[PDB]
Amino acid sequence: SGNKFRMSLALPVGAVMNCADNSGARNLYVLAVKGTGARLNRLPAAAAGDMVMATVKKGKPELRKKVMPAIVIRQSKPWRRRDGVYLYFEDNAGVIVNPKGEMKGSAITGPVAKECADLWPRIASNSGVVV
Amino acid sequence: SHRKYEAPRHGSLGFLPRKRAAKQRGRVKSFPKDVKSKPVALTAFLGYKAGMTTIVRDLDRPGSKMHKREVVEAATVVDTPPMVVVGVVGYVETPRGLRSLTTVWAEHLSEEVRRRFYKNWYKSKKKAFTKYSGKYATDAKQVETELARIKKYASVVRVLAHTQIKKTPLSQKKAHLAEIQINGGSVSDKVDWAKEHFEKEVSVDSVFEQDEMIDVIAVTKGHGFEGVTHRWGTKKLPRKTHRGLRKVACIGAWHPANVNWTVARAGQNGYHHRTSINHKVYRVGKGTDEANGATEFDRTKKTINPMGGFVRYGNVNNDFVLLKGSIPGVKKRVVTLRKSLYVDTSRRAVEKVNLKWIDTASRFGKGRFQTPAEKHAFMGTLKKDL
Amino acid sequence: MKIEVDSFSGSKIYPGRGTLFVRGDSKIFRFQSSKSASLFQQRKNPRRISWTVLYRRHHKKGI
RNA sequence: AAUAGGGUGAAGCCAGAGGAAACUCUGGUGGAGGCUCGUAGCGGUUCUGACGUGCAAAUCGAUCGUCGAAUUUGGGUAUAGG
RNA sequence: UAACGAGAUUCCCACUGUCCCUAUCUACUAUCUAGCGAAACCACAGCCAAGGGAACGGGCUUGGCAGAAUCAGCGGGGAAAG
RNA sequence: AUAACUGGCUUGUGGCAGUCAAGCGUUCAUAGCGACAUUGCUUUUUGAUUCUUCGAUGUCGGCUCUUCCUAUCAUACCGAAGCAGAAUUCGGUAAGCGUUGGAUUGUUCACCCACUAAUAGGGAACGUGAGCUGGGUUUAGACCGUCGUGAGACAGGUUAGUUUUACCCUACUGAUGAAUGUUAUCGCAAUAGUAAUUGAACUUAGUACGAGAGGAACCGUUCAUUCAGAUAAUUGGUUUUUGCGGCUGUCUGAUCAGGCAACGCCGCGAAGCUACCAUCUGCUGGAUUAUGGCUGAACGCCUCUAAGUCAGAAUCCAUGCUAGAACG
Numbered sequence A: 001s002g003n004k005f006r007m008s009l010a011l012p013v014g015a016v017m018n019c020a021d022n023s024g025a026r027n028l029y030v031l032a033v034k035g036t037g038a039r040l041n042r043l044p045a046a047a048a049g050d051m052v053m054a055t056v057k058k059g060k061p062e063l064r065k066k067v068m069p070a071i072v073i074r075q076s077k078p079w080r081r082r083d084g085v086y087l088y089f090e091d092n093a094g095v096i097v098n099p100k101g102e103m104k105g106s107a108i109t110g111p112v113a114k115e116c117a118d119l120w121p122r123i124a125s126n127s128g129v130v131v
Numbered sequence B: 001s002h003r004k005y006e007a008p009r010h011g012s013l014g015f016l017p018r019k020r021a022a023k024q025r026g027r028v029k030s031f032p033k034d035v036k037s038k039p040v041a042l043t044a045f046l047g048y049k050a051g052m053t054t055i056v057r058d059l060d061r062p063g064s065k066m067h068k069r070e071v072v073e074a075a076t077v078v079d080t081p082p083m084v085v086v087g088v089v090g091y092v093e094t095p096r097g098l099r100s101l102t103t104v105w106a107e108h109l110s111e112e113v114r115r116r117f118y119k120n121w122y123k124s125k126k127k128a129f130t131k132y133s134g135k136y137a138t139d140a141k142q143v144e145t146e147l148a149r150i151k152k153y154a155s156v157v158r159v160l161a162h163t164q165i166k167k168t169p170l171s172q173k174k175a176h177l178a179e180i181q182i183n184g185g186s187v188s189d190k191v192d193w194a195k196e197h198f199e200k201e202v203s204v205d206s207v208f209e210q211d212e213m214i215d216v217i218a219v220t221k222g223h224g225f226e227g228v229t230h231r232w233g234t235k236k237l238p239r240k241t242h243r244g245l246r247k248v249a250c251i252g253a254w255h256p257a258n259v260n261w262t263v264a265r266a267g268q269n270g271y272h273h274r275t276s277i278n279h280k281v282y283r284v285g286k287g288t289d290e291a292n293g294a295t296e297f298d299r300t301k302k303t304i305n306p307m308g309g310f311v312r313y314g315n316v317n318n319d320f321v322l323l324k325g326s327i328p329g330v331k332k333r334v335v336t337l338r339k340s341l342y343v344d345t346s347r348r349a350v351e352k353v354n355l356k357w358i359d360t361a362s363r364f365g366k367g368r369f370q371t372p373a374e375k376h377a378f379m380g381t382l383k384k385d386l
Numbered sequence C: 001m002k003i004e005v006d007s008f009s010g011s012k013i014y015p016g017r018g019t020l021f022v023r024g025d026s027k028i029f030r031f032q033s034s035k036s037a038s039l040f041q042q043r044k045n046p047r048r049i050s051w052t053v054l055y056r057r058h059h060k061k062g063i
Numbered sequence D: 001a002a003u004a005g006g007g008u009g010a011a012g013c014c015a016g017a018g019g020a021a022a023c024u025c026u027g028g029u030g031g032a033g034g035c036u037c038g039u040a041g042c043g044g045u046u047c048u049g050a051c052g053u054g055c056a057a058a059u060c061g062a063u064c065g066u067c068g069a070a071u072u073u074g075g076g077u078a079u080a081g082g
Numbered sequence E: 001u002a003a004c005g006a007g008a009u010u011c012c013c014a015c016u017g018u019c020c021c022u023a024u025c026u027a028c029u030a031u032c033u034a035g036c037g038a039a040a041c042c043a044c045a046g047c048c049a050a051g052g053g054a055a056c057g058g059g060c061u062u063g064g065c066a067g068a069a070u071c072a073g074c075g076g077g078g079a080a081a082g
Numbered sequence F: 001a002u003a004a005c006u007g008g009c010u011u012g013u014g015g016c017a018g019u020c021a022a023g024c025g026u027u028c029a030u031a032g033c034g035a036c037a038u039u040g041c042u043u044u045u046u047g048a049u050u051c052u053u054c055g056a057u058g059u060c061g062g063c064u065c066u067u068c069c070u071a072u073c074a075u076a077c078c079g080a081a082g083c084a085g086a087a088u089u090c091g092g093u094a095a096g097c098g099u100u101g102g103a104u105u106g107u108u109c110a111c112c113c114a115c116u117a118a119u120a121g122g123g124a125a126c127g128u129g130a131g132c133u134g135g136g137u138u139u140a141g142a143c144c145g146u147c148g149u150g151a152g153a154c155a156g157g158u159u160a161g162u163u164u165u166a167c168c169c170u171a172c173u174g175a176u177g178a179a180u181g182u183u184a185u186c187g188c189a190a191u192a193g194u195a196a197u198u199g200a201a202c203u204u205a206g207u208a209c210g211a212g213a214g215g216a217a218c219c220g221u222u223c224a225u226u227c228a229g230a231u232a233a234u235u236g237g238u239u240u241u242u243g244c245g246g247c248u249g250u251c252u253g254a255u256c257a258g259g260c261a262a263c264g265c266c267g268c269g270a271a272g273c274u275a276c277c278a279u280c281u282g283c284u285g286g287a288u289u290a291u292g293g294c295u296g297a298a299c300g301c302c303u304c305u306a307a308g309u310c311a312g313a314a315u316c317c318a319u320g321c322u323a324g325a326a327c328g
Ligand SMILES: O[C@H](c1cc(C(F)(F)F)nc2c(C(F)(F)F)cccc12)[C@@H]1CCCCN1
Pocket: F139, F140
């Protein structure tokens, strides 16, 4: 439920990002990106605000070894906003959510990209500083 | 056997051959279709690509996430001094296409346009158009007769106009002479307009209005001989491939026992003729105005020129056109600006542009000042200032 | 449009110029170019960098 | 006839500490080994690199094995086509 | 089975243009010039489609067509060369 | 004269498609199927044969790239239903346009994970090795198991094993060019090519439909995927600007200023080049296919059809875009 402009992709398949919620996961390993079409040899890749299918590589045992949705909330790859500003964070981070985009955990450490907060009201609810 | 996996074509088959343009001046392949009920007006203009800049603009697009909010946008500056009308051509509809019937010229042609007809001007006697200038002897009824022939027989009337390249910073002294089709009114009206405009200047503000969508005809940047990887964007072969990797591995099946016209091959890249459409006019600036770069919100008396001039062009001291985005060609390239070939009523086409601010920092580096006065105020007195 | 100030060198940032850096503690730094951006990621001290405005004010030059 | 410079630190030897004894523990010294890192040297793993009508009828470059012995090598000498 | 291994294999950390997905730079070539100057190969040669044919033609039959002389590349064909 | 590839005849076998209509489908042969039979097509399987090649046509697979077929997976438009809606199934015109990222295996094949509108099937000497690679097979080294007295065999397992040449002709991609009095400028347009693609969100609307559960669509708006053509504002990358600064060793007696370290090293670094790693741009008319119709006979009724005619698909031809016939 939103229409975000194109952003520089930061997280190809196989990337491991930080998990920024208190759900108990410490890693989030990207294995797919929602909405990725077909192109030979091209890896699916995610930007901030993208829904991703991920597994927990490092974390609580009941969160590990499962496929689960997650939403990327910040990226260290610089990207340009329509107001001309190129910005980036120190790391790539995401949060575990439902297929509907509703967070499983209930608290986010660190800033959240405005594209993600504008696009996911739940993450906006659980977010502190929004950039 | 079939491809193991499917993939789209590399490159467009609608732009073959990828060869050099026959001329450096891009030529208008097609002019806007003539409607008699409109007034008599030019349909194209010639200008010179000066450089690119940046603007800030409030977007007026309801339903957008940037609506009523500032956007930062790239813009292109086209130096466009007024063109001089020197001739008129009549065209006749024939079962083989349009055919030029007659060309009538003005009595006096300027030196920059008379240089167009010479390869070695300094070695010439400069005899061009002297007997034709004599054709005007005291009644010029032969000339009116040719104009009457155009009125009687021509169906398409085009004017001959040349740029005043001496008003630009270019070191070239040859003017650029082009045919610009006249639309509107009857053929007699078009011929009368051309005659009354012989040896007169026509400005951009008489051809293009603000918020228009216009097309740009130009020859692109030349890159010389280029391989398939950058000419056609094909996949590089693995690192460990013998005899090199910037190639297309299979250039054909065994049969047909020939190389097909559709296989990507190394060859000349760039310097192609392109027509790029739907570039919005953000500003038709005036050369006499000392506040070219000023807006209604930034009243700093400021020209469009960056500090130190446009890099590898110079200063734009003439009337100019500020276009949205990028246009084909390089700096100093002659660019043909053509009116649109259709009527666009989309919100992007009918939006009214109001500029907030125009970037005039140096393009020769990471410029951080908009004006020498601002630079002085920021840095204070220097040793060289005494 | 408003003009920002470089967190490192203190020079004016005009629309579209430079980059914005969000630190892990949610603090925002603005750099006009890759020069000050590189010195910032290189951990340089603007009080010890002779050309910044902060340096000039620390040494009371042009005041 | 030839084989930089380091590391490790075996026997043998000297001294101290702890105890009734049995003895144990510790600090030095010493300089062993078909030991080890690594030059010269000998070899030739990988790039399946270069070259591949070559510089060369086997070479070139990087990388690599080994480098005090079952080591490397000159000359003299012996063994000759079932 | 400790130790050892340019032996074969799997996983993990670090690392990276291996890759997403490519871009840029340097020297030597290639290129052009003066001088010097080979070789493989060669029935005759050299545009296609279909047909028939030793059942996949440069030549034959029927069509498409077809305008001197050429340069850099290239690797579809010459069922190319060895 | 004769096997192991391709190709050729054949098409048993493999694959695909008909017709008949006993039954299935609460009733009901034919919405969807369809036994017993029977007629075909294909050469993407495997056989049969041995016609070409043994003075050699480089024999697996993958990577890369182009094109073609349609027996259509998706997308456009439609007809049918055991089609209320949503979903789905059967069918028509249709190849314009797309058909993916990975774990294991040398694999073709397979099998899972995941995205997607969809992850359709094939051909081009089982496309493609002077394009690559060389994991497999299929020289010579070696090990094992079974077999053999043995040398040795295995279509069984395992490990290591040189992949040569284009400068010729043609063809493709670009680049010049004699002559059609000379030279110059501006043009026309025959012919050839062609380009865009798909999704999501908001609204319609919790509306139509439905007892409820559930639950659409057209007009419109904002974005996005894949592709295409440019461009260098900005941001990033690149650095022989060896531009500026810094650092080690050594050399010029010291200083200043320099040389060398097979660009000595490091930070920044303009300009240039360049990135869905950046930005911009990607048109509107006509004629039709399937199909649904009008008037209207044949056949005093009926009938979209016989004469005539209307609308109508991602189709076709133009508009537009690229080249410009080097003998228009
Ligand atoms: O040992 C030679 C040899 C054979 C073969 C093979 F038959 F397998 F293809 N390949 C060889 C190769 C090969 F190309 F690597 F396969 C290299 C050197 C000698 C080879 C033989 C000896 C008998 C005469 C033919 N060459």
